[PDB]
Write an enzyme that holds these catalytic residues in place. Structure first.
Site, short mmCIF file in Angstrom:
data_model
loop_
_atom_site.label_atom_id
_atom_site.label_comp_id
_atom_site.label_asym_id
_atom_site.label_seq_id
_atom_site.Cartn_x
_atom_site.Cartn_y
_atom_site.Cartn_z
N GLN A 1 -0.41 -0.11 2.87
CA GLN A 1 -0.23 0.96 1.88
C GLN A 1 -1.52 1.15 1.12
O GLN A 1 -1.96 0.25 0.41
CB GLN A 1 0.91 0.60 0.94
CG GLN A 1 2.24 0.54 1.66
CD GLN A 1 3.39 0.20 0.77
OE1 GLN A 1 3.23 -0.11 -0.41
NE2 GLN A 1 4.59 0.26 1.33
N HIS B 1 2.86 0.66 -5.36
CA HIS B 1 3.01 1.98 -6.03
C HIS B 1 2.26 1.89 -7.33
O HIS B 1 2.63 1.13 -8.22
CB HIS B 1 4.49 2.38 -6.23
CG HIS B 1 5.10 2.76 -4.90
ND1 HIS B 1 5.17 1.93 -3.83
CD2 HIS B 1 5.64 3.97 -4.51
CE1 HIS B 1 5.75 2.62 -2.82
NE2 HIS B 1 6.04 3.86 -3.23
N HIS C 1 1.81 -6.36 1.90
CA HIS C 1 3.10 -7.05 2.02
C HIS C 1 3.97 -6.51 3.16
O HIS C 1 4.82 -7.24 3.67
CB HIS C 1 3.83 -6.96 0.70
CG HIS C 1 4.11 -5.56 0.31
ND1 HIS C 1 3.14 -4.74 -0.16
CD2 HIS C 1 5.26 -4.82 0.40
CE1 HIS C 1 3.67 -3.54 -0.37
NE2 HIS C 1 4.97 -3.59 -0.03
CU LIG Z 1 4.38 0.18 -3.78
#
Ligand SMILES: [Cu+2]
Ligand SMILES: *[C@@H]1O[C@H](CO)[C@@H](O)[C@H](O)[C@H]1NC(C)=O
EC number: 1.14.99.56
Length: 223
Positions: A166, A1, A157
């Site tokens: 991601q 993030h 991960h």
């Molecule tokens: Cu993240």
């Protein structure tokens, strides 16, 4: 993030969301087939900006990654969680007007990548522990003019299955000056350049421990 929320050029930060199309939410895109894979987008909301940043061809710019738009610091926690191991990558796309082009479709060419080095350390770790700095060379030999710069960090991960990887990306709006136009890159599309079956997208980074890594997308364009 994390969010690529400003660009530094010639030692000067161009401002928060100034010439970089930034979301307020720091969540990833996880669907490589979505139009959002190009310059971020739904289910996020991305702000527009009228600023187009002038940069000299052959010089490096530095994407500045931060946890949120409100983040003031540049410590590791202020950049991205240390679990988020993966590559950093950057692309250009020649466009008519860098303030209005969406970025979706063909025209992208890769200009930087940093996967895993010989000491086992990942590109994202260099950004996390390097004040969020992601250095990217604008090629000397491309045509001058309006471009989008797509800077990306891929966290692996949770990538053992797909969906899982991601993808964090934002697009900066550039006016490249001094490019010689000596070489025209071959290009790829976003969406299109990545697939869920790519060895760098579906990947268990733990089982077994990875010693080498294939960054997704095309080869890096060189002059
Ligand atoms: Cu993240
Ligand atoms: C400029 O960016 C390129 C990647 O595009 C890299 O090879 C080079 O090390 C960078 N220069 C720096 C960080 O000073």
């Amino acid at each position: 993030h994390t969010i690529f929320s400003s660009l530094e050029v010639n030692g000067v930060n161009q401002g928060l969301g100034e010439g970089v199309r930034v979301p307020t939410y720091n969540g990833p895109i996880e669907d490589v087939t979505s139009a959002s894979i190009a310059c971020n987008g739904s289910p996020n909301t991305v702000a527009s900006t009228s600023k187009v940043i002038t940069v000299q061809a052959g010089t490096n710019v530095t994407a500045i990654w931060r946890y949120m738009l409100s983040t003031t610091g540049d410590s590791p926690a202020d950049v991205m969680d240390s679990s988020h191991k993966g590559p950093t990558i950057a692309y250009l796309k020649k466009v008519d007007n860098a303030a209005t082009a969406s970025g979706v479709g063909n025209g992208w060419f890769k200009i930087q990548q940093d996967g895993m080095d010989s000491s086992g350390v990942w590109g994202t770790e260099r950004v996390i522990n390097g004040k969020g700095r992601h250095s990217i060379k604008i090629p000397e030999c491309i045509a001058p003019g309006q471009y989008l710069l797509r800077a990306e960090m891929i966290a692996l991960h949770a990538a053992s299955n797909y969906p899982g990887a991601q993808f964090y990306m934002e697009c900066a709006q550039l006016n490249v000056v001094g490019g010689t136009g000596a070489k025209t890159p071959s290009t790829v599309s976003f969406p299109g350049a990545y697939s869920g079956s790519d060895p760098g997208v579906k990947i268990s980074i733990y089982w077994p421990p990875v010693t080498a890594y294939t960054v997704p997308g095309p080869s890096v364009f060189t002059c």
